[PDB]
Amino acid sequence: QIDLNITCRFAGVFHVEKNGRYSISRTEAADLCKAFNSTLPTMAQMEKALSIGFETCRYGFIEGHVVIPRIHPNSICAANNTGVYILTSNTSQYDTYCFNASAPPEEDCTSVTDLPNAFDGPITITIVNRDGTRYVQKGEYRTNPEDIYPSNPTDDDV
Incomplete structure (x- = not known):
């Protein structure tokens, strides 16, 4: 009963969003x-992505630490801070960051970026279209390929 969303990929880096928060x-x-x-x-x-365009007012998890890069924040942030800030996450869970090698060294917001084996588990997930604006979800024409070749020949003799 949970869904995920994959936003643009800045130099391979991206954050995995959920259905809600x-x-x-x-x-x-x-x-x-x-x-x-x-x-x-x-x-x-x-x-590094901070200069590529990874503005976020919510730290995340990494290989082994917790950072929060800020570029063009607002008053909603910590006194309109800036640059990158390191700080553990004692509070409950939170967003998560991931780095891909397949994607290009620049912002990638198109196809050619899905699961490693393309499997469907007890959790749904979608990515951003080519327009790299608003990801799609519960769209049409999303039926998995599956055909059947029933061999049932026929004949008749006098």
């Missing part, structure tokens, strides 16, 4: 990334 655990983060042919980010990768 952020609710991803650390131990689950790894599985999440790997479940999408991706792997947990790093300490430098995060601060």
